[PDB]
Amino acid sequence: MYFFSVDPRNGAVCGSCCCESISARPGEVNGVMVSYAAWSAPLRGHGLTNKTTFEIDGVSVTPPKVSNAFGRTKVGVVFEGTLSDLFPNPEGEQVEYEISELNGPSNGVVELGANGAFTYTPGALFTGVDRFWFSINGNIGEYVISVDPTTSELPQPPFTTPVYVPAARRSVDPRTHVLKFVLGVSPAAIPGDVYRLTVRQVAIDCDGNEFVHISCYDISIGSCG
C-alpha cells in the first residue's frame, strides 16, 4: 500500500517537474492512500468530497507488438478462434504461442491447438464478458470474449489500458483527510514504460464552496518486483 503526503501549498521531491514516483509490476493490482491532512486541515471546513478525477498519460509507451481481438459468442455454445493473424511476425520467427495459467479465463477453459488455434468453452449457465492473456513469443496481448444470453447480443467493452484506475473503488475519509484508490496494471504493460497519473481533488469549506488541488505521480512499469 503506497502512502503519500500532499504539500500544503505554502511555497515552502521535485524530481523532474513536480510529480511523485510509483513503481509497479505488470499484472498487480495495488492500493494507494494520499493524505490531504496537511493541505485541508488549516482550511477548517467539512473535509474532502467524493469528486476526484484521474487522468493517465504515457511519457514512455513502447508501442505494443501483438494486437488484441474481440468475440461475441453465445451461451453454452463452444467458441473457436485463431491466434495467427494477431502477431505480424515481421522478421521470420517461430510463432510459438502460450496461454499463461496465471491469467487464464474466468468462467471457461481454453484449448490451445497446435498452430495458434484455441477452443473456448464458456461455463454453463453464464452470460457476460471474459478475458484471457496470451504470450506470442514473449510479447503479451489479450483476447476478450462476450458470451451473450441467446436473446440478441451484448455490448462491446473497452480493451483495458496498460495502467488504469478502477471505475468505482475510490473513497475519502473527511475525518482524517485521506483519499484511497486502486492502481491496476495490465499484464500487457511492457517493462520500462513510464506513465503519468494526475489527480484533481476538491475540498469544501463550511459554506459549500470549493478548493482545488492538482498533483501527479509517475508510474514506472518495472519487471521483477
Partner: protein, 369 residues
C-alpha cells in the same frame, strides 16, 4: 612486440580529449539556410569540422561562434541555438521550450534589438529565481549607439553585461561581444573569484582592431558608461545595476565576480544541506532520544552557522553580526500555531562579496633637497 601478451592496451591518437567539459556557453543568432540543421533546436556543436553547413554560412552566427570557437582553446562546451530569419530584425523569441532545464552558464545574443535582449533577460532572471531548481545562468549582450541612446537603451537587469559601443567602432559589434563572453567563461568557469579586466586578465585575443588616435567614448563618456553600467572596453567588467528595489546604492551586485561567487555559494549550500535529508527533526520536546539519529532546529542552526564560518573569506567576507545575518526560523515559530506543519523551515543569510582592490589615487608631490 612486448605488447602481444594483452596487459597493456595503447591507442596512440593525437586528437584525444580528457577534460571534464562543463562550462556550457550558449550562442544565439540569426542564420542563413545554407546551414543544414534544424533551427530552433539547441545543438551542442563540436569543434570546427561541423561548421557553416550546421548553422549557416556567412550569417552573424558564423562569425560569432568562430570568434568563440577561437578565444578559449579548451574548457567549454559550446552550445548553439540557431534562430531563423524571416527595421526587419526577425527577433521574436519566447522559447523556454526549446531551451529548458538543461542549463547554460554563459549566454551571448548577437542582436542589438532591445526586445530580444529583454526576453533573454527575463529567461535568465526566471532561472535565477527563488524556484528550488537552480542553475544560475548569466548572459552577455552588446549595445551600440550614441551616449544618449546607450544610456536610454538600458535597464536595471544585472543578469547581463550589456556592452557599449560608439558609432565609430570599426569591428562589427556582435563580434567583440561573443569573444568577451567566450573569454570569461573559459577563464572563470572553475574559479569564480577571478574578474575579467585590466590587460593580462581580459584582453580580447581575436579582435585585431585598426589602431588610431581618436579612441571613441571620451573620458567623460567613459565615466558616464562605467558609473551607469556598460562594460566599455576591456575594463570594468561590472553588470549594469545602478539601483535596487527602492534605494539606489546596492554596491554588492555590481561586479560579475560577485555574481559568480554568489552562484557558487548557492550551489555549495544546496549540495551541502542534503545531509539533512532523512535525519528526523524533533520540534516539540526538543529532546532527541538515546540511540536514534536526529536533530533539533537549534542544532540545525548551529550547524549552518559553523558551515558559514568556514567558507568565510573565500566565498563570503566577514559576516559582521553573525547572530543576525544567518537566521533559521521553523514553520511553527513564525506562524501562530494553527497553520503550522513540521518539516518546513526558513533560512535567510547575508551575502557580502569579498572586498576587492580598486583605484589607488596617487598624489606624488616633487620638491628639491
Amino acid at each position: 612486440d612486448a605488447l602481444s601478451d594483452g596487459f597493456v592496451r595503447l591507442c596512440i591518437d593525437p586528437s584525444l580529449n580528457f577534460f571534464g567539459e562543463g562550462c556550457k556557453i550558449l550562442v544565439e543568432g540569426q542564420m542563413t539556410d545554407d546551414g543544414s540543421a534544424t533551427p530552433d533546436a539547441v545543438t551542442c556543436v563540436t569543434s570546427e569540422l561541423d561548421i557553416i553547413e550546421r548553422f549557416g554560412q556567412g550569417s552573424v552566427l558564423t562569425e560569432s561562434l568562430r570568434k568563440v570557437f577561437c578565444t578559449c582553446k579548451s574548457g567549454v562546451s559550446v552550445y548553439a541555438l540557431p534562430r531563423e530569419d524571416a527595421s526587419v530584425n526577425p527577433t521574436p523569441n519566447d522559447y523556454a521550450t526549446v531551451v529548458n532545464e538543461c542549463c547554460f552558464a554563459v549566454y551571448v545574443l548577437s542582436s542589438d534589438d532591445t526586445d530580444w535582449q529583454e526576453n533573454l533577460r527575463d529567461w535568465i532572471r526566471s532561472a535565477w529565481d527563488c524556484s528550488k531548481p537552480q542553475c544560475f545562468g548569466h548572459g552577455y549582450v552588446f549595445n551600440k549607439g550614441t551616449l544618449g541612446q546607450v544610456l536610454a537603451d538600458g535597464d536595471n537587469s544585472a543578469e547581463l553585461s550589456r556592452l557599449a559601443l560608439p558609432t565609430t567602432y570599426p569591428v562589427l559589434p556582435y563580434l567583440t561581444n561573443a569573444a568577451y563572453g567566450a573569454l570569461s567563461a573559459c577563464s572563470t568557469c572553475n574559479n569564480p573569484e577571478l574578474n575579467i579586466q585590466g590587460q593580462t586578465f581580459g584582453l580580447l585575443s581575436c579582435i585585431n582592431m585598426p589602431e588610431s588616435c581618436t579612441p571613441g567614448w571620451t573620458f567623460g563618456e567613459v565615466t558616464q558608461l562605467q558609473a551607469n553600467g556598460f562594460v566599455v572596453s576591456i575594463y570594468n567588467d561590472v553588470t549594469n545595476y545602478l539601483r535596487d528595489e527602492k534605494n539606489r546604492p546596492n554596491a554588492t551586485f555590481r561586479d560579475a565576480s560577485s555574481r559568480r561567487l554568489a552562484a557558487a555559494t548557492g550551489v555549495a549550500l544546496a549540495e551541502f544541506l542534503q545531509q539533512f535529508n532523512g535525519l528526523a527533526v524533533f520540534t516539540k520536546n526538543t529532546n532527541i532520544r538515546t540511540g536514534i539519529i536526529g536533530t533539533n532546529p537549534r542544532l540545525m542552526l548551529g550547524k549552518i552557522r559553523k558551515w558559514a564560518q568556514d567558507n568565510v573569506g573565500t566565498l563570503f567576507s566577514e559576516f559582521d553580526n553573525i547572530n543576525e545575518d544567518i537566521q533559521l526560523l521553523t514553520d511553527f515559530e513564525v506562524q501562530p500555531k494553527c497553520v503550522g506543519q513540521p518539516g518546513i523551515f526558513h533560512l535567510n543569510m547575508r551575502y557580502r562579496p569579498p572586498v576587492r582592490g580598486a583605484r589607488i589615487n596617487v598624489n606624488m608631490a616633487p620638491a628639491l633637497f
